[PDB]
Amino acid sequence: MKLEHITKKYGSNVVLNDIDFDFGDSRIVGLIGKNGVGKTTVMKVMNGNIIKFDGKVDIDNADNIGFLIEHPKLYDNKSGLYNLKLFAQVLGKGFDKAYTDKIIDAFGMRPYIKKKVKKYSMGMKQKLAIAVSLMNKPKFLILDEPTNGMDPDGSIDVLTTIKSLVNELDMRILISSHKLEDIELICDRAVFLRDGHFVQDVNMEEGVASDTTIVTVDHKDFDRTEKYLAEHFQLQNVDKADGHLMINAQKNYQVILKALSELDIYPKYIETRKSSLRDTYFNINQRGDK
């Protein structure tokens, strides 16, 4: 799934304007923008529903594609197991009991997998829809707001199960959803859509230069601390008058404090300044509303 020089117009309304996309060493990607900017249009282009792409798409025939678009689509009068069997025979290669039982058991819909879908709730149908998407045996999974009708702990549980299946079986996920604080827990990269183009792409592990980590230390320890940081990581700002040292952001503080505790150094303070997706999105999008 790649797009190169894609432009799509509806009459006089330009939805997409020369957008490029590529999975380069990343597993989970998030797509963020406003409502009616043409996110669902991107999903349809990425899925295969729209036909007038005006560009080039290079797809191998052996790779399978699984998707979920805005609301679940199911057969109301029939049961969940019927839906699972049908989408396994029609879209996938076939039906296998071990794969379906492991998927069903991990998500947790076994007690009510034999009940009628008409009696389900919204979160149960959304989870079943995700299971139907996985029934395809896809190589790329494309989900449109998978977490809209469930409470935060349930959302967290669903996301943890999704990442776990990403790791036991090789899958690439594209997620567009609101409640961005839940996406930022488990995601590898994010793309921001504005004015028809992908304006910003942020990889959080490598960071941005605005992220800083503030370490405060004693006057006596400044030379040794500077020596250790100069050996190991990159140093951006050092202030002797302040007594404050700024280093690149690190998610885990264990190794850092191990080394300083080994050199008889105890920091006064530690904190990190980082830009989250809420801060970055609001800063970028304040440019057209405010």
Binding site: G48, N49, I50, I69, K73, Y75, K78, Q89, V90, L91
Partner: protein, 249 residues
């Protein structure tokens, strides 16, 4: 493989057809109505020696079974479009074409099953009563007529539902097109100074004569009629394939 995708869609569609209680409620009602009408009209309207005339049973059973097979086809083809699960199928070109092939095969099998049902009902009526039996060539010709009628109307309604994406509209136009023309024709054709001219011109528009010969107890066609009807079916199929591979949701 594409073969499994096509056969699973036709097979599961057929499974949903054979697994409903309304299918048997409909067969029981139609069989009861046809048996009551034939027995009541034949055993006392002139006090015969229990002779029964088969033209009325042929025409009545044929009329009810066509209007039911027509609605069963419309429901079958519009189930997926009603719930919007068609979005899951209109992904790649090969699946988009296999979908139409599967729908056509489903239409063929539903027509064959209903023809067998008609045969069973008629065999039971002949077995119970006393008279002179019919011929197998009539039943074979009946099978062909079922196929042409159901295929033509199903492809027309498929094109209309592709253009409109509305299911209530399909139900109304299907019922409207089948039952309005035989009902409207007696009250209007004999009136003008153009009725004979329009009547001769009536042999080339497919809608009028395909619906008109539905209630007839005999059905024979000329070569030009056969070529035009088959060509219309083929053109509708090609047009459907072209629209399905070029429409955007």
């Amino acid at each position: 493989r594409g073969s499994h995708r096509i056969l699973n869609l036709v097979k599961y569609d057929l499974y949903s057809i054979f697994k409903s209680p309304l299918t048997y409620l409909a067969i029981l009602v139609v069989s009861s109505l046809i048996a009551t009408q034939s027995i009541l009209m034949a055993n006392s309207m002139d006090n015969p020696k229990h002779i029964i005339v088969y033209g009325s049973v042929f025409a009545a059973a044929k009329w009810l079974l066509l209007i039911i097979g027509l609605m069963f086809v419309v429901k079958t083809i519009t189930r997926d479009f009603s719930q919007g699960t068609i979005q899951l199928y209109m992904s790649k070109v090969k699946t988009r074409v296999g979908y139409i092939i599967s729908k056509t095969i489903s239409i063929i099998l539903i027509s064959i099953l209903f023809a067998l049902i008609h045969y069973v009902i008629l065999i039971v009526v002949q077995a119970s009563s006393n008279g002179k039996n019919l011929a197998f060539s009539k039943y074979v010709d009946n099978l062909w007529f079922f196929l042409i009628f159901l295929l033509f109307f199903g492809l027309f309604l498929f094109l209309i539902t592709l253009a409109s994406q509305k299911t209530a509209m399909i139900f109304s136009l299907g019922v409207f097109l089948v039952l309005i023309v035989p009902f409207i024709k007696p009250f209007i054709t004999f009136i003008p100074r153009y009725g004979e001219k329009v009547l001769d011109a009536f042999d080339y528009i497919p809608f009028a004569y395909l619906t008109d010969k539905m209630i007839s107890s005999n059905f024979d066609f000329s070569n030009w009629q056969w070529v035009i009807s088959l060509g219309s079916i083929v053109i509708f199929f090609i047009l459907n394939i072209l629209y399905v591979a070029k429409k955007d949701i």
